[PDB]
Amino acid sequence: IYNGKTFNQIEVKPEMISHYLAEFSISYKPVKHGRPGIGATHS
């Protein structure tokens, strides 16, 4: 399934019927937060 950059590989299971193919190919990388940069506070 194309996610805008790559074709994520999946195998269809009986429990995924009636669902969209988009639901199994995440289009974004989950966010892991680094230390805040300059300008995050003192606003």
Partner 1 sequence: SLVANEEFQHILRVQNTNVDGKQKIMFAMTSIKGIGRRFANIACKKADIDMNKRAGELSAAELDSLMVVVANPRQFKIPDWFLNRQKDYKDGKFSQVTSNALDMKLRDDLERLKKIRNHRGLRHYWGLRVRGQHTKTTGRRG
Choose which of 5, 6, 29, 30 interacts with partner 1 (CB under 8 A).
Answer: 30
Regarding 35 and contact with partner 1 (CB under 8 A), the answer is no
Tell me if 17 sits within 8 A of 34, measured CB to CB.
Answer: no
If contact means CB under 5 to 8 A according to the sort of partner, which of RNA, partner 1, none does residue 40 touch? RNA
* Token duo for residue 26: 């995440």
- The amino acid occupying position 14 is P
Per-residue exposure over 7-24, b if at least 16 CB sit within 10 Å of its own CB, e if not: eeeeeeeeeeeeeeeeeb
If contact means CB under 5 to 8 A according to the sort of partner, which of partner 1, RNA, none does residue 10 touch? partner 1
Residues at the site binding partner 1, with contacts judged by CB under 8 A: 10, 13, 15-16, 19, 22-24, 26, 30
